[PDB]
Ligand binder design. Structure first.
Ligand SMILES: C[S@@+](CC[C@H](N)C(=O)[O-])C[C@H]1O[C@@H](n2cnc3c(N)ncnc32)[C@H](O)[C@@H]1O
Ligand SMILES: [Ca+2]
Ligand SMILES: [Ca+2]
Ligand SMILES: [Ca+2]
Ligand SMILES: [Ca+2]
Lengths: 504, 342, 143, 146
DNA sequence: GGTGGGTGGTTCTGGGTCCATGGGCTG
DNA sequence: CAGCCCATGGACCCAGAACCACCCACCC
DNA sequence: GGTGGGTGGTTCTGGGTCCATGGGCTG
DNA sequence: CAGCCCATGGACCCAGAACCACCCACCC
């Protein structure tokens, strides 16, 4: 911030007043401390005299380096002396091979940024504005590696059907077994009282595919293999997967799916910020259905909500909590539910909003989540726990997400006894904010499609007694999933609450 | 292979003879074939006309791009016309940003290898031998990502003792669990009566430390996550790991060792060949005992062997077998045992 | 025969994995090799992008041009992207004045052979024995 | 002093966690920060690397030189890499021509304060309470006139 | 404006001990 | 036989030692 | 030597349909 | 009550168009 820039200018004069020194060994200490304090904010750190190699090979020594958590450099700094001209020595140092990707050539009087061999900002120092601009741009430069994680995300967004074909073939050839065929008919029974009252054997096959597909990506792209060994839902499903994904078969499928997973895991390993890796979490969430089951993508209305809307919808509810009621999001009693959590962007951005002191109490028992599909549920849970690791500190299993049909949770969530009692504690809580993004689906394409939004008996009964009752409209389109979620939200809300939805 | 280049010498003339063309687009098919064919063996492949972007954000298209299994470019080819003076045209397309990593500027009568912004050689196209040498240099270039893997292997040797200290703390926290104490007696007694009659609980703790250290590395930098649930002794020491590798306890140890693993994890992700992983395997095999049990590392004399020593051995063994017993090394029936594997 | 036909498929599968691109620009290299080899093996060649001129005076450019020793043309190859209904792009090419003597209009999935002006045959390029049939016919169509 | 020393620790592990090196040049950034911050509130300032003269020599160069508001040197610090044995790096240093009027000889996990002609007390840097007591004396040492 | 001392990394390279521990006497 | 006598080669470190990189104080 | 023209790839940007399905009512 | 009328707004996608890179014939 510009505050830090002013602090540096006060240290620059202090060095030439207390020590009276004009040597590079002493006029640069000020900038060393400045970049160091800005860096600790971004997530990098400045490490001095890192001997690096040049284009010729000659060991060079940029006075500093913006090292990451995987010890990769996001940038460099070369402080010279106040007296020597910078533009001449910039071109003499560069000749020996000095870096040019993101180097801040400084001289205790003028700071230039040559980014990509290109002077972008020659801000003369001693500035109450654009010097802060310079450091912002430097600490927010895009590493050449992030633009490849972006390229690999798009390829996978388009070689997903070819990869899914492999997983599809596997599940068909497993139906030749009597251990698969026996356990996939018990999955169906437990899931004909929990999530889908019309759970088909082909819905159980879909869940199996998602579980395996995301398992390989969670242990490599995101490094978290222990998620599947802890998550109640995963365990109930490996019972069904380690019936065919075992020894030889397991190895065969994994080695056949490598010519697709490879590149993504070779660019997702060179980035080390989860917020950048969240772009793939979103991509997988949507693309999977469009490349496998678009019928599910229709009624569930799987879609991602741009962060700008979410962040607005969070700060606005905080600025309404003290207006009509009297509280602040980080208070005690602001129980924030979020039906329809999808990729989890409504609780990940809340973690980032909450301060780093009361966050513990809020993360533990005030943030709640609700999901119906498997891929979104898994993605959301992992995302929330990884955002907690990036914000607070030690990974702590989020124990408030559930797999229940929100509109039907009024023996719901019986897939795992854990999620059943997790949704029972959720039901018992005095919820106060109901934020979220409901599905806006209403009617099918053509009647040869055969895809009606599940009639929610309990919920549509109050719609008929409230919204539909007053509406004398000859046609009745108040049974939209968005209006059904609104009915559920108004009835969960007891008193003093702020329903915040974004819809048609 | 001068063999594969021998055919290039003819296909170049043949393509100008069986059809009187001299333009680059018509005569470049010969060099395409030569490059793509040599690559098939080396492990790479040549993907033609790759629209790789460059500095300043302009988009460029080399005639060919030698890519690997991780879609990571390892070398670029670019062909101009014979009339166009290669030397002058080289800098013309270097300004558009055409990579300077490993580009082969090739006219019909002359080729120029340019490694790290430096002309290595300028072989004439007539000699099959010179051309083969140039192409071998182009195929045996260590991309930036293997000098970075190599730097990290050195750091892992220095980070070994501190990573092992965290694993010792993990095994001591386990030694406080009664579930682990019981599981220990079963393993100590079993490994004693099955490997060497003087096994100790500390040897079992050391063996567990090896199991969990190799375990996390095998599930990421080696990505053979299944190995630990298919190998007999891996499942025999899986109970000794699970005892303290559960929920919060596992998380703590994994996150503590992550600061050491991260370096070699990323490095072995941008690598694909097993030969690079072999260097890290050798380092782990040695450094561990040097920084934990040097007493064991004298009774097991843990040291790795020179590759040239076993390469020459394998040559000699076949020639000797085929001069006294008249059998090939690959003749079904010759059983080969390796007592001290390492 | 069938060996070279299978080799073409292998090459194309490596292009869509080592590069990931399914664009013809990179995929054509596989069929270029197959056509060039069966040719040398049956006394011929596959000189590439040789500009032909049409009756209307259009400098057309087929992706291939099977030519023989006295420098005359015997066949022409034209590969289209694997991302278009082939029987549509065939018309567009021929409407520029593309040769109709013996032309292989080929997309990554289907290979259509035209001779004089009629579709002689269309094969799934995946079936080894079937392509082997169509390719042999193209290399044996004598004036 | 106690909260400040308890943050010099954090930025020590940070040099190795982010950079991945234990060479003296990079690990000296933590102690530099600590000393400068402590001196600021007290009034003084650690001006790093002020070439100081010698009895026998052309010139020497300490890596820390507490210089008061009136440009007068009243204390110093010479860092050490973990490789060297600190004790033998001390005699090597105080022989070339290094000052002894007030100098902190710190390695990375142990620190002595050779003050005005003799060592005071040797403290380990892992212990916050210990390093606190010693740095206080580096800062509460005043010449005899004062 | 050079230009060497002076601090620090860095990578070679030349060169070299006391003493375990079985067996054969052996009283 | 036990308790003395007699052999007889040994799965590496490391202290300089150049030597360079950066850079400040002194001759030019 | 430029240059327009063939071949192919890569971004933008503009621009818009019949028909599902619950209520309300004759009958 | 049960057929029989009467609404009423509906979570994208794909063809051109501009334009760009690369090389070839053809004016120069
Ligand atoms: C728009 S997405 C969630 C949006 C989320 N903010 C995001 O950015 O991904 C809608 C999600 O609601 C979930 N969902 C949960 N309960 C549901 C219910 N009762 N009916 C429909 N969808 C439900 C679906 O599984 C689906 O993934
Ligand atoms: Ca400098
Ligand atoms: Ca070319
Ligand atoms: Ca074509
Ligand atoms: Ca020092």
């Amino acid at each position: 911030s510009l505050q830090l820039v002013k602090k540096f200018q006060k240290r620059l004069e202090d060095i030439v007043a207390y020590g009276g020194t004009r040597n590079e060994s002493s006029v640069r200490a000020a900038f060393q401390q400045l970049l160091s304090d800005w860096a600790e904010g971004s997530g990098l750190r400045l490490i001095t005299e890192v001997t690096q190699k040049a284009v010729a090979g000659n060991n060079v020594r940029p006075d500093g380096t913006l090292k990451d958590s995987l010890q990769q450099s996001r940038g460099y700094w070369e402080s010279k002396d106040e007296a020597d001209t910078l533009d001449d020595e910039i071109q003499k140092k560069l000749a020996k091979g000095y870096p040019r990707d993101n180097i801040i050539f400084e001289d205790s009087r003028l700071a230039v940024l040559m980014q990509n061999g290109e002077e972008v900002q020659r801000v003369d120092m001693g500035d109450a504005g654009a010097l802060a601009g310079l450091l912002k741009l430097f600490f927010e430069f895009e590493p050449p590696q992030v633009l490849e994680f972006r390229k690999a995300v798009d390829h996978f967004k388009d070689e997903m059907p070819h990869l899914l074909k492999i997983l599809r073939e596997a599940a068909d050839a497993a139906e030749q077994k009597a251990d698969y065929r026996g356990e996939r008919d018990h999955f169906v029974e437990i899931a004909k009282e929990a999530i889908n009252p019309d759970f088909s054997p082909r819905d159980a096959r879909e869940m199996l595919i998602q579980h395996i597909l995301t398992g390989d990506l969670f242990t490599s792209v995101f490094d978290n293999a222990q998620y599947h060994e802890d998550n109640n839902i995963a365990q109930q499903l490996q019972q069904l997967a380690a019936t065919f994904y075992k020894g030889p078969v397991k190895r065969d499928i994994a080695e056949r799916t490598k010519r697709y997973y490879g590149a993504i895991q070779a660019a997702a390993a060179q980035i080390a910020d989860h917020h950048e890796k969240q772009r793939f979490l979103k991509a997988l969430y949507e693309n999977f259905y469009r490349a496998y089951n678009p019928a599910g993508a229709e009624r569930l209305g799987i879609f991602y909500t741009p962060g700008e809307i979410v962040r607005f919808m969070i700060e606005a509810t905080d600025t309404l909590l003290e207006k009509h009621f009297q509280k602040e999001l980080a208070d005690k009693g602001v129980e924030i539910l979020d039906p329809a959590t999808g990729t989890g962007t409504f609780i990940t951005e809340l973690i980032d909003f909450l301060p780093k002191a009361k966050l513990e109490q809020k993360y533990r028992e005030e943030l709640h989540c609700n999901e119906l599909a498997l891929l979104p549920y898994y993605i959301a849970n992992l995302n929330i726990e990884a955002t907690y690791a990036q914000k607070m500190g030690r990974y702590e299993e989020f124990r408030n997400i559930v797999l229940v049909d929100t509109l039907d949770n009024t023996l719901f969530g019986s897939v795992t006894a854990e999620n059943l009692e997790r949704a029972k504690r959720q039901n018992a809580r005095p919820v106060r904010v109901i934020i979220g993004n409901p599905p806006y689906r209403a009617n099918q394409a053509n009647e040869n499609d055969n895809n009606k939004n599940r009639e929610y008996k309990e919920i549509d009964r109050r719609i008929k007694a409230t919204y539909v009752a007053a509406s004398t409209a000859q046609k009745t389109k108040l049974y939209d999933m968005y209006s059904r979620f609104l009915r559920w939200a108004t009835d969960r809300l007891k008193e003093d609450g702020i329903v915040a939805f974004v819809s048609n």
